[PDB]
Design an enzyme around this catalytic site. Structure first.
Site, PDB file in Angstrom:
ATOM      1  N   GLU B  16       0.829  -1.199   0.000  1.00 30.90           N
ATOM      2  CA  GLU B  16       0.000   0.000   0.000  1.00 30.90           C
ATOM      3  C   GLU B  16       0.870   1.259   0.000  1.00 30.90           C
ATOM      4  O   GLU B  16       1.939   1.290  -0.615  1.00 30.90           O
ATOM      5  CB  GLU B  16      -0.906  -0.007   1.235  1.00 30.90           C
ATOM      6  N   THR B  18       0.881   5.931   0.651  1.00 36.14           N
ATOM      7  CA  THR B  18       0.199   7.183   0.346  1.00 36.14           C
ATOM      8  C   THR B  18       0.128   7.382  -1.162  1.00 36.14           C
ATOM      9  O   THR B  18      -0.954   7.525  -1.728  1.00 36.14           O
ATOM     10  CB  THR B  18       0.939   8.383   0.964  1.00 36.14           C
ATOM     11  N   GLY B  20       0.054   5.542  -3.454  1.00 34.18           N
ATOM     12  CA  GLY B  20      -0.894   4.659  -4.109  1.00 34.18           C
ATOM     13  C   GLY B  20      -0.739   3.190  -3.756  1.00 34.18           C
ATOM     14  O   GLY B  20      -0.491   2.842  -2.602  1.00 34.18           O
ATOM     15  N   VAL B  22       0.837  -0.848  -5.091  1.00 31.33           N
ATOM     16  CA  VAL B  22       1.767  -1.594  -5.930  1.00 31.33           C
ATOM     17  C   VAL B  22       1.257  -3.032  -6.101  1.00 31.33           C
ATOM     18  O   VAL B  22       1.004  -3.737  -5.114  1.00 31.33           O
ATOM     19  CB  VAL B  22       3.176  -1.637  -5.312  1.00 31.33           C
ATOM     20  N   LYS B  37       3.252   0.129  -9.886  1.00 27.34           N
ATOM     21  CA  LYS B  37       2.890   1.083  -8.849  1.00 27.34           C
ATOM     22  C   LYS B  37       1.851   2.004  -9.474  1.00 27.34           C
ATOM     23  O   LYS B  37       2.153   2.764 -10.391  1.00 27.34           O
ATOM     24  CB  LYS B  37       4.106   1.882  -8.367  1.00 27.34           C
ATOM     25  N   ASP B 131      16.145   7.667   2.237  1.00 23.85           N
ATOM     26  CA  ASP B 131      15.138   6.892   2.946  1.00 23.85           C
ATOM     27  C   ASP B 131      15.516   5.435   3.009  1.00 23.85           C
ATOM     28  O   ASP B 131      14.691   4.544   2.789  1.00 23.85           O
ATOM     29  CB  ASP B 131      13.766   7.071   2.295  1.00 23.85           C
TER      30      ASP B 131
HETATM   31  O1  LIG Z   1       8.011  -5.497  -2.653  1.00 26.94           O
HETATM   32  C1  LIG Z   1       8.463  -6.520  -3.176  1.00 26.94           C
HETATM   33  C2  LIG Z   1       8.501  -7.835  -2.368  1.00 26.94           C
HETATM   34  C3  LIG Z   1       7.094  -8.379  -2.145  1.00 26.94           C
HETATM   35  C4  LIG Z   1       6.327  -7.916  -1.032  1.00 26.94           C
HETATM   36  C5  LIG Z   1       5.017  -8.392  -0.802  1.00 26.94           C
HETATM   37  C6  LIG Z   1       4.446  -9.345  -1.678  1.00 26.94           C
HETATM   38  C7  LIG Z   1       3.128  -9.842  -1.476  1.00 26.94           C
HETATM   39  C8  LIG Z   1       2.590 -10.797  -2.382  1.00 26.94           C
HETATM   40  C9  LIG Z   1       3.348 -11.261  -3.493  1.00 26.94           C
HETATM   41  C10 LIG Z   1       4.669 -10.785  -3.727  1.00 26.94           C
HETATM   42  C11 LIG Z   1       5.242  -9.831  -2.847  1.00 26.94           C
HETATM   43  C12 LIG Z   1       6.552  -9.336  -3.047  1.00 26.94           C
HETATM   44  N1  LIG Z   1       8.942  -6.577  -4.432  1.00 26.94           N
HETATM   45  C13 LIG Z   1       9.077  -5.569  -5.481  1.00 26.94           C
HETATM   46  C14 LIG Z   1       8.698  -4.231  -5.384  1.00 26.94           C
HETATM   47  C15 LIG Z   1       9.025  -3.650  -6.601  1.00 26.94           C
HETATM   48  C16 LIG Z   1       8.831  -2.184  -7.059  1.00 26.94           C
HETATM   49  C17 LIG Z   1       7.935  -1.268  -6.225  1.00 26.94           C
HETATM   50  C18 LIG Z   1       9.451  -1.099  -6.178  1.00 26.94           C
HETATM   51  N2  LIG Z   1       9.580  -4.631  -7.390  1.00 26.94           N
HETATM   52  N3  LIG Z   1       9.616  -5.792  -6.725  1.00 26.94           N
END
Ligand SMILES: O=C(Cc1ccc2ccccc2c1)Nc1cc(C2CC2)n[nH]1
Lengths: 258, 302
Positions: B16, B18, B20, B22, B37, B131
């Site tokens: 989740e 602010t 939006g 992903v 995202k 960050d």
């Molecule tokens: O953020 C994660 C790990 C993650 C975290 C939670 C999950 C929940 C369900 C399935 C896969 C999941 C995978 N990976 C990720 C984030 C991103 C881009 C937003 C930066 N690319 N890859």
């Protein structure tokens, strides 16, 4: 002196060559002219003063505007909308907290709508393909100032002044890279205030000799001399303030004796 | 615009926030798995968010194996999508899942090594992350780790001013920031990294402050309250108080017990008080701690 100081200068020199707008784009615009652009930029300076924006914001916006106009035909009545959007984006990129869109609509005296401004933002972003982190004269001056043992605030304010004036006239500054304009401004300011010249350390760092800066220097000196007579005055006024040690009031040397 | 969005099949929600949401998604035509995202632009009618502006513009300039790849950007009439490469897990969840066993030192070394490489690349390209925390670090099954979440990132071709709101979560916040310095420097990212390094090693946060003052005290209580000799100018900083307690420096072998001489050496240089003296990512990479670095694969409990 930072640890990535050199890597960064090298990278900035690489990127300035890429975010470079078309030198002859204005002749290809059917409806706008250099004077119209001059008037627009002068206006942005005031806006920047009104909302107390960083100088870097001003330089980014001008860079966004010149790149946009290098590929998009714009009519008189839309020039200001493009500049408003460019300032909005530049503020978002550089300011800690940019003014809300409503403020940008206000400073246009409701010539455009919040809707038109946001749509122009989208178009500008598309036209520039989100490449907003462009190198500016401001950035090169900053890097140059670290190479100044006799750190002089008057020298800095004046170099900033000369760098800002170059933004007003597409002719002949559009044909010069930011690092070169910065170099000329730096030397001219250093010369006027301390009588010193382009330092050996910067010759080594930039590879620019006083000789290579000459073409731009001659132009910048001319702009400096004529500065009081120029149709646009927002920048001189700005630099009369004590914040900049009133360097716009300093008298430009008569010759550069290069 | 909406043609591209039709080529994506939503798989499941990743997270989740602010800005939006992903989602993990799949390119229907190529089979490529990605992270989408999604940013709604009608939740403020302020145009494209400043965070997106920065993450997009800065990330597309950073192409490195240890930095998350921004694959595409789709800007519709009211929605903005950023398409990223996909990674299986984030460091925070992994640390959480490794509580019982702990993360093997060789893997910890590998991760720090890769993180410093990614950070050095950012810095040599005038980008400050600002960050760095476990949650923003992504890892895969191959043993690679990458920096992500560049929403608060900033170009520093021109000095970056300090902002009260846009700041790292408390626990990884550098002391210069807590004491109210004027500008950020690359040193704040190195400090965050040191805190993560220590956390991975000990299985506990290094400085889990409850508030700004408590955060500072946690740091002082461990590293010692800094003085003019240790950090020239510290007593003149905006939020410095002469009434601050004067704590003595704790012995490092007791702060991070499982670390050897090299590890303790690298960590203390990453936690140096004076930001001008805090080691850089570039120089850290040359430290003898990474003399025998390898690339182990983690045990991911997916
Ligand atoms: O953020 C994660 C790990 C993650 C975290 C939670 C999950 C929940 C369900 C399935 C896969 C999941 C995978 N990976 C990720 C984030 C991103 C881009 C937003 C930066 N690319 N890859």
């Amino acid at each position: 002196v930072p640890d990535y100081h050199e890597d960064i200068h090298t990278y900035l020199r690489e990127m300035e060559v890429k975010c470079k707008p078309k030198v002859g784009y204005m002749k290809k615009q059917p409806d706008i002219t250099n004077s119209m652009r001059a008037i627009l930029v002068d206006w942005l300076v005031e806006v920047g003063e009104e909302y107390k924006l960083q100088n870097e914001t001003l330089h980014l916006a001008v860079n966004y505007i010149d790149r946009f106009l290098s590929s998009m035909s714009v009519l008189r009545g839309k020039l200001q909308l493009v500049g408003t959007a460019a300032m909005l984006l530049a503020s978002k990129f550089e300011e800690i907290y940019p003014p809300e869109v409503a403020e940008f609509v206000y400073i246009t005296d409701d010539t455009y709508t919040k809707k038109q401004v946001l749509r122009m933002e989208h178009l500008v972003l598309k036209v520039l393909t989100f490449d907003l982190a462009a190198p500016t004269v401001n950035q090169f001056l900053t890097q140059y100032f670290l190479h100044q043992q006799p750190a002089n605030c008057k020298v800095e304010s004046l170099a900033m002044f000369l760098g800002e004036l170059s933004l007003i006239d597409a002719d002949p500054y559009l044909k010069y890279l930011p690092s070169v304009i910065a170099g000329a401004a730096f030397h001219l300011a250093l010369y006027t205030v301390t009588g010193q010249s382009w330092p050996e350390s910067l010759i080594r760092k930039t590879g620019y000799t006083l000789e290579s800066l000459k073409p731009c220097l001659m132009d910048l000196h001319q702009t400096y001399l004529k500065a009081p007579q120029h149709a646009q005055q927002s920048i001189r006024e700005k630099y009369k303030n004590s914040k900049y040690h009133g360097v716009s009031l300093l008298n430009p040397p008569e010759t550069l004796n290069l | 615009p909406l043609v591209d969005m039709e080529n994506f099949q939503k798989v499941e929600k990743i997270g989740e926030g602010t800005y939006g949401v992903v989602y993990k998604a799949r390119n229907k035509l190529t089979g490529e798995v990605v992270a989408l995202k999604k940013i709604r632009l009608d939740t403020e009618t302020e145009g494209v968010p400043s965070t997106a502006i920065r993450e997009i513009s800065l990330l597309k300039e950073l192409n490195h194996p240890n930095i998350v790849k921004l694959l595409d950007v789709i800007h519709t009439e009211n929605k903005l999508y950023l398409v990223f490469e996909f990674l299986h897990q984030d460091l925070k969840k992994f640390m959480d899942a490794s509580a019982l066993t702990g993360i093997p030192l060789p893997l910890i070394k590998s991760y720090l090594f890769q993180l410093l490489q990614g950070l050095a690349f950012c810095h040599s390209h005038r980008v400050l992350h600002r960050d760095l925390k476990p949650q923003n670090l992504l890892i895969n099954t191959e043993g690679a780790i990458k920096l992500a979440d560049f929403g608060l990132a900033r170009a520093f071709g021109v000095p970056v001013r300090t902002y009260t709101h846009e700041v790292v979560t408390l626990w990884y916040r550098a002391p210069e920031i807590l004491l109210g310095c004027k500008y950020y420097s690359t040193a704040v990212d190195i400090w965050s990294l040191g805190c993560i390094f220590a956390e991975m090693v000990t299985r506990r946060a290094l400085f889990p402050g409850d508030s700004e003052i408590d955060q500072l005290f946690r740091i002082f209580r461990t590293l010692g309250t800094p003085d003019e000799v240790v950090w020239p100018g510290v007593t003149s900083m905006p939020d410095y108080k002469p009434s601050f307690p004067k704590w003595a420096r704790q012995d490092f072998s007791k702060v991070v017990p499982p670390l050897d001489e090299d590890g303790r050496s690298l960590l203390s240089q990453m936690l140096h008080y004076d930001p001008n003296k805090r080691i850089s990512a570039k120089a850290a990479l040359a430290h003898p701690f990474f003399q025998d670095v390898t690339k182990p694969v983690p045990h991911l409990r997916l």
